[PDB]
Write a protein that binds this ligand. Structure first.
Ligand SMILES: [Mg+2]
Ligand SMILES: [Mg+2]
Ligand SMILES: [Mg+2]
Ligand SMILES: [Mg+2]
Ligand SMILES: [Mg+2]
Ligand SMILES: [Mg+2]
Ligand SMILES: [Mg+2]
Ligand SMILES: [Mg+2]
Ligand SMILES: [Mg+2]
Ligand SMILES: [Mg+2]
Ligand SMILES: [Mg+2]
Ligand SMILES: [Mg+2]
Ligand SMILES: [Mg+2]
Ligand SMILES: [Mg+2]
Ligand SMILES: [Mg+2]
Ligand SMILES: [Mg+2]
Ligand SMILES: [Mg+2]
Ligand SMILES: [Mg+2]
Ligand SMILES: [Mg+2]
Ligand SMILES: [Mg+2]
Ligand SMILES: [Mg+2]
Ligand SMILES: [Mg+2]
Ligand SMILES: [Mg+2]
Ligand SMILES: [Mg+2]
Ligand SMILES: [Mg+2]
Ligand SMILES: [Mg+2]
Ligand SMILES: [Mg+2]
Ligand SMILES: [Mg+2]
Ligand SMILES: [Mg+2]
Ligand SMILES: [Mg+2]
Ligand SMILES: [Mg+2]
Ligand SMILES: [Mg+2]
Ligand SMILES: [Mg+2]
Ligand SMILES: [Mg+2]
Ligand SMILES: [Mg+2]
Ligand SMILES: [Mg+2]
Ligand SMILES: [Mg+2]
Ligand SMILES: [Mg+2]
Ligand SMILES: [Mg+2]
Ligand SMILES: [Mg+2]
Ligand SMILES: [Mg+2]
Ligand SMILES: [Mg+2]
Ligand SMILES: [Mg+2]
Ligand SMILES: [Mg+2]
Ligand SMILES: [Mg+2]
Ligand SMILES: [Mg+2]
Ligand SMILES: [Mg+2]
Ligand SMILES: [Mg+2]
Ligand SMILES: [Mg+2]
Ligand SMILES: [Mg+2]
Ligand SMILES: [Mg+2]
Ligand SMILES: [Mg+2]
Ligand SMILES: [Mg+2]
Ligand SMILES: [Mg+2]
Ligand SMILES: [Mg+2]
Ligand SMILES: [Mg+2]
Ligand SMILES: [Mg+2]
Ligand SMILES: [Mg+2]
Ligand SMILES: [Mg+2]
Ligand SMILES: [Mg+2]
Ligand SMILES: [Mg+2]
Ligand SMILES: [Mg+2]
Ligand SMILES: [Mg+2]
Ligand SMILES: [Mg+2]
Ligand SMILES: [Mg+2]
Ligand SMILES: [Mg+2]
Ligand SMILES: [Mg+2]
Ligand SMILES: [Mg+2]
Ligand SMILES: [Mg+2]
Ligand SMILES: [Mg+2]
Ligand SMILES: [Mg+2]
Ligand SMILES: [Mg+2]
Ligand SMILES: [Mg+2]
Ligand SMILES: [Mg+2]
Ligand SMILES: [Mg+2]
Ligand SMILES: [Mg+2]
Ligand SMILES: [Mg+2]
Ligand SMILES: [Mg+2]
Ligand SMILES: [Mg+2]
Ligand SMILES: [Mg+2]
Ligand SMILES: [Mg+2]
Ligand SMILES: [Mg+2]
Ligand SMILES: [Mg+2]
Ligand SMILES: [Mg+2]
Ligand SMILES: [Mg+2]
Ligand SMILES: [Mg+2]
Ligand SMILES: [Mg+2]
Ligand SMILES: [Mg+2]
Ligand SMILES: [Mg+2]
Ligand SMILES: [Mg+2]
Ligand SMILES: [Mg+2]
Ligand SMILES: [Mg+2]
Ligand SMILES: [Mg+2]
Ligand SMILES: [Mg+2]
Ligand SMILES: [Mg+2]
Ligand SMILES: [Mg+2]
Ligand SMILES: [Mg+2]
Ligand SMILES: [Mg+2]
Ligand SMILES: [Mg+2]
Ligand SMILES: [Mg+2]
Ligand SMILES: [Mg+2]
Ligand SMILES: [Mg+2]
Ligand SMILES: [Mg+2]
Ligand SMILES: [Mg+2]
Ligand SMILES: [Mg+2]
Ligand SMILES: [Mg+2]
Ligand SMILES: [Mg+2]
Ligand SMILES: [Mg+2]
Ligand SMILES: [Mg+2]
Ligand SMILES: [Mg+2]
Ligand SMILES: [Mg+2]
Ligand SMILES: [Mg+2]
Ligand SMILES: [Mg+2]
Ligand SMILES: [Mg+2]
Ligand SMILES: [Mg+2]
Ligand SMILES: [Mg+2]
Ligand SMILES: [Mg+2]
Ligand SMILES: [Mg+2]
Ligand SMILES: [Mg+2]
Ligand SMILES: [Mg+2]
Ligand SMILES: [Mg+2]
Lengths: 44, 272
RNA sequence: UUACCACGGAGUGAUUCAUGACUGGGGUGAAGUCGUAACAAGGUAGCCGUAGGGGAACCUGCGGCUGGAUC
RNA sequence: GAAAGACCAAGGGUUCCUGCGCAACGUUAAUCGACGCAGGGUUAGUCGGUUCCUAAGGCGAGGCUGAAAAGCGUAGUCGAUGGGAAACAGGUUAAUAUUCCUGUACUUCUGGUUACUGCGAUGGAGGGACGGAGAAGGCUAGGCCAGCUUGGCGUUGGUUGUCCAAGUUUAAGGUGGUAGGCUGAAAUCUUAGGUAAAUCCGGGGUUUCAAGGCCGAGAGCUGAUGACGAGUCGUCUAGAUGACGAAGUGGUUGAUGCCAUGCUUCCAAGAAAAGCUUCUAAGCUUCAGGUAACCAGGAACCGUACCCCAAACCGACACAGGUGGUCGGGUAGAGAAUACCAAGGCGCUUGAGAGAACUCGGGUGAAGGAACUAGGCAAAAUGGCACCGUAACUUCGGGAGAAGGUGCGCCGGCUAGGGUGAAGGAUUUACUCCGUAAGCUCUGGCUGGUCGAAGAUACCAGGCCGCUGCGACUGUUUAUUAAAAACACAGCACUCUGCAAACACGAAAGUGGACGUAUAGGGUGUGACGCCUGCCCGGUGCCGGAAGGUUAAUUGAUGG
RNA sequence: CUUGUCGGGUAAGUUCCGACCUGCACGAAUGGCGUAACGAUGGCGGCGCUGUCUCCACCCGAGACUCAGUGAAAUUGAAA
RNA sequence: CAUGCUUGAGGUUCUAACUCUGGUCCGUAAUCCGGAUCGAGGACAGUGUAUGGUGGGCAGUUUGACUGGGGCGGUCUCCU
């Protein structure tokens, strides 16, 4: 049976990557929200 | 001509093809071609704005000359071709100095002809000149609405308009729709009728022939739920218990929708 | 033991008789009901072919004939 | 064994190899391990990226629009799943190899020397450059057979021979211009065109000839007196190591691979851009630049271990699930089905007993033969190739493999053809034409004999027929209890829309409709085809009319 | 109402097929009536075939059972 | 009556505001966008504001209680 997660590293970086967040203000709010919490990862 | 097919299969019983042996069967003229990509009925927001569109064959765009502004120079009809994105045929003209062009083929042009354009041209079919020096009562096609804009009206297969009256700086002609309209006399037109008048006798025959042209199936509103259509709902078959209406709430059995008010003075009388 | 072959058997058709719930017209019969279509110019001249309509004879349209009266 | 064998891509990330270990992990034990500790292991001008070019799409200076955030978009520049330079065989490690080594290649750039020269783009032309189906060929890989070389003479009748086993291999590149495909060629004089120019492309006139020109598998030769090769000799520790090393040829068959982006044909009419060739503009012109020959040198950076239809990826698991592409041998067989095997891989990480009921998956069954049951559910049965023969009805295609029947193994006798192909013949005198005995291979015909219970003998492999309802048919649908009579459909009808179209998404700019133009586009109902589709405009809607009644903001006479 | 009545098919037919018309409460593009071919579509009837059944019997593998190893689950106020 | 001065309404016509998803020139290497100029329409169209009509396209809600179960029916205040 096919499952929901079919990995692809190129489609991963283009949707959730660092340069994708920085392109819009709503993604820039996500990054500043994750910096205030102290997240070690900070991006996909 | 029209060719009927033998009922060898269930999908061949009602196919009526329109096949023309005089059409060119080589490759189109390459310099006058450019790519065009499909849309599926989607605008720049990505939303479906016109529905029942999608699929079909891959097509090139033929740059058809709708202005015909090489006045004085004679031309020759090199061949008559097939256009995937018209219902009429097109003709490749070759002027007296190279300069090959595509135009909408008139009914009678096959392989020779001269098809000159401009002031002083004869009254043969396929010639083009301003609508003012065109004898009244004649049949024309490819009428332009603004000077220098190109043909707009009577371009489909078998289409024509009749020149009925002329007075002042305008001229009056009767459209194929039944509508009386006045056009500027400075505008241009072509003499005759558009080719491929037998196109209306075809029969597709099967559901897959419609999909070849990029048309998707149509679902009736009475086959939906109340949340999708105003016609939806009911136990068993129902008949759209309200007055027949569009999916967006507009009445469709006879209610007029023209509200221009800027071009009203150009209508001598409506088609009704 | 082989060949020929009658009876008999299986499958699928054709043709012809009898019969069949129920239905369609036809003919005949009795002081029955409704109308008056034709025969006189029969009171809208009648007939022929065809199409539509009507309880019914019939009516109407189109084309044809005199086997139509007064003049 | 069309995988449970190999190999790419995605994904994973040290799981790879070696030494030491067994607490935990492994559905049992473990000395073993995809487990713990420690070392080691991935070598490129040619492979894949990057670099060059663009598709859908994204972003987008200025710009237009918008309470703000922001939206759309021009120049532009990103974006492969596509286009664009060039390598193959043989050795070698515990672990890498088209990368290291050996041998033989190819591509591209830089710097010097000489000789001869009109150079120059962002721009113009050519080219790149392409659909579905089908059919004749030509060829190759691969497979068989024969010969040759080496070895053998069989625990039991025979086996020195029309015996048995193994091997009989070899690339890129160069040369060759063939089967075959496309196409007329040359000179001269000009020019309403290709935004400017043009010696380039396109158009026109005249003369001469029937010959050129461009593509193109493959054969042969060469690479190759080399590598490889059963095995032999020697040395060392039951194996490695150095040297040596036989034959290595012919005939048939033959692809879904190549010619082939070819040819024929049909409608639904079948990517772009750059690299590449050519032309000139702005500018140089004896400096720059270009074209040949020779010499010297370079080709950077990144990835290369391992799994990869799975115990390493997606499923919480060492989970009967899912996962794109390539190769794919022998005997039967139409076949990539099926059966038994090859190369290669594995026996699926709890076992041992015994032989109760009952459950699961199967085999056979007396006499009946649907009596079972809501219902022939399930099971049983039919099943191939050739030939004979086949009803109502029909839209004349069909129904139809209707129904039903006959033959089929093996060994001889006689006999008919096709393909390939020595020698010969022609002269077009060599990658050529005709044609060949033997050999090999393929397709038949009519005549006997013979064994068994049974010869389409196993695997494989349609049950059929007669009345009716519904839907014309192929198709689609409730991922996970409903596949249908439901949806779609070709056909039919009504209605709207004259183009800055109706309509739809958008506070708007704008976009789709459509680079379409009433034989078109949108909405609605019905649903092939045949015969048809009757009466009602009182209600509600829509269309038309405009006389007369009412009737908004607005105005502000009059009175208080 | 209703398993309406009549005919056929069965030894026997609330289903099936052909009619009648008394249409509770058919009907003409929410189309009417037919229709060859088609359907993992609904109903009925036959031939063949049979463990579907009378009515089960025997046989073969995997569990169940015993021995060794590892080792769950729902549930549970307390139980003589 | 004849005019003068306004001012309600209608028609015609003009260009000069406005509009052009028409042509050609420039910014410019550019189907956007501006500026210039021809052509067309033209005080209309269109937008702001005020106002009448339409408007399940969309929204926030309402739709009683008793009751020998609820629903249907009946009842709900006052007098004997
Ligand atoms: Mg082109
Ligand atoms: Mg549509
Ligand atoms: Mg189209
Ligand atoms: Mg439709
Ligand atoms: Mg539909
Ligand atoms: Mg509809
Ligand atoms: Mg439905
Ligand atoms: Mg529904
Ligand atoms: Mg929706
Ligand atoms: Mg609604
Ligand atoms: Mg319904
Ligand atoms: Mg109903
Ligand atoms: Mg209803
Ligand atoms: Mg009469
Ligand atoms: Mg009579
Ligand atoms: Mg009478
Ligand atoms: Mg009379
Ligand atoms: Mg009378
Ligand atoms: Mg007669
Ligand atoms: Mg008559
Ligand atoms: Mg009448
Ligand atoms: Mg008459
Ligand atoms: Mg008459
Ligand atoms: Mg990887
Ligand atoms: Mg992982
Ligand atoms: Mg290991
Ligand atoms: Mg060890
Ligand atoms: Mg232990
Ligand atoms: Mg253990
Ligand atoms: Mg380890
Ligand atoms: Mg772009
Ligand atoms: Mg943008
Ligand atoms: Mg900006
Ligand atoms: Mg780029
Ligand atoms: Mg790629
Ligand atoms: Mg390895
Ligand atoms: Mg080397
Ligand atoms: Mg140059
Ligand atoms: Mg170019
Ligand atoms: Mg391509
Ligand atoms: Mg093809
Ligand atoms: Mg061979
Ligand atoms: Mg020997
Ligand atoms: Mg022996
Ligand atoms: Mg012996
Ligand atoms: Mg060789
Ligand atoms: Mg070669
Ligand atoms: Mg040739
Ligand atoms: Mg490697
Ligand atoms: Mg590797
Ligand atoms: Mg693998
Ligand atoms: Mg495998
Ligand atoms: Mg797992
Ligand atoms: Mg396991
Ligand atoms: Mg698994
Ligand atoms: Mg095989
Ligand atoms: Mg077979
Ligand atoms: Mg198999
Ligand atoms: Mg093996
Ligand atoms: Mg046991
Ligand atoms: Mg047992
Ligand atoms: Mg059993
Ligand atoms: Mg059995
Ligand atoms: Mg037995
Ligand atoms: Mg029995
Ligand atoms: Mg027996
Ligand atoms: Mg028996
Ligand atoms: Mg029997
Ligand atoms: Mg029974
Ligand atoms: Mg019973
Ligand atoms: Mg069954
Ligand atoms: Mg079976
Ligand atoms: Mg039949
Ligand atoms: Mg048969
Ligand atoms: Mg049949
Ligand atoms: Mg016998
Ligand atoms: Mg019937
Ligand atoms: Mg029925
Ligand atoms: Mg169907
Ligand atoms: Mg199909
Ligand atoms: Mg689907
Ligand atoms: Mg599905
Ligand atoms: Mg379901
Ligand atoms: Mg189905
Ligand atoms: Mg299902
Ligand atoms: Mg459905
Ligand atoms: Mg329409
Ligand atoms: Mg319907
Ligand atoms: Mg129907
Ligand atoms: Mg009325
Ligand atoms: Mg009305
Ligand atoms: Mg009105
Ligand atoms: Mg009943
Ligand atoms: Mg009954
Ligand atoms: Mg009965
Ligand atoms: Mg029964
Ligand atoms: Mg009607
Ligand atoms: Mg109805
Ligand atoms: Mg019917
Ligand atoms: Mg189907
Ligand atoms: Mg049926
Ligand atoms: Mg029975
Ligand atoms: Mg135990
Ligand atoms: Mg637009
Ligand atoms: Mg402009
Ligand atoms: Mg003007
Ligand atoms: Mg206005
Ligand atoms: Mg206004
Ligand atoms: Mg307003
Ligand atoms: Mg206003
Ligand atoms: Mg509502
Ligand atoms: Mg509401
Ligand atoms: Mg309301
Ligand atoms: Mg609503
Ligand atoms: Mg509230
Ligand atoms: Mg509420
Ligand atoms: Mg209330
Ligand atoms: Mg209550
Ligand atoms: Mg009660
Ligand atoms: Mg009670
Ligand atoms: Mg009540």
């Amino acid at each position: 049976m096919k499952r929901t997660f079919q990995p692809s590293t190129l489609k991963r970086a283009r949707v959730h990557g660092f340069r994708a967040r920085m392109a819009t203000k709503n993604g820039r709010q996500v990054l500043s929200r994750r910096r205030a919490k102290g997240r070690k990862r900070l991006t996909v | 001509a029209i060719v009927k097919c033998k009922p060898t299969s269930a999908g061949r019983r009602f196919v009526v093809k329109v096949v023309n042996q005089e059409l060119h069967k080589g490759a189109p003229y390459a310099p006058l071609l450019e790519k065009k990509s499909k849309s599926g009925g989607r605008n720049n927001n990505g939303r479906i704005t016109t529905r029942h569109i999608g699929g079909g064959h891959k097509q090139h765009y033929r740059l058809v000359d709708f202005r015909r502004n090489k006045d004085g120079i004679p031309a020759i009809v090199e061949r008559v071709e097939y256009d995937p994105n018209r219902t009429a045929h097109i003709a490749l003209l070759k002027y007296a100095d190279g300069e090959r062009r595509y135009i909408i083929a008139p009914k009678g042009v096959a392989a020779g002809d001269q098809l000159i354009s401009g002031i002083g041209a004869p009254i043969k079919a396929g010639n083009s000149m301003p609508l003012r020096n065109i004898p009244v009562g004649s049949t024309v096609h490819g009428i332009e609405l603004k000077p220098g804009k190109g043909a707009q009206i009577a371009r489909s297969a078998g289409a024509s308009a009749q020149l009925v009256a002329r007075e002042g700086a305008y001229v009056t002609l009767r459209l194929r729709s039944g509508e009386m309209r006045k056009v500027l006399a400075e505008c241009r037109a072509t003499l005759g009728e558009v080719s491929n008048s037998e196109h209306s006798l075809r029969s597709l025959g099967k559901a897959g022939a419609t999909r070849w042209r990029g048309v998707r199936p149509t679902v009736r509103g009475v086959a939906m739920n109340p949340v999708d259509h105003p016609h939806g709902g009911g136990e068993g078959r129902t008949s759209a218990g309200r007055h027949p209406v569009s999916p967006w709430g507009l009445q469709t059995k006879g209610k007029k929708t023209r509200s221009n008010k800027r071009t009203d003075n150009m209508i001598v009388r409506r088609r009704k």
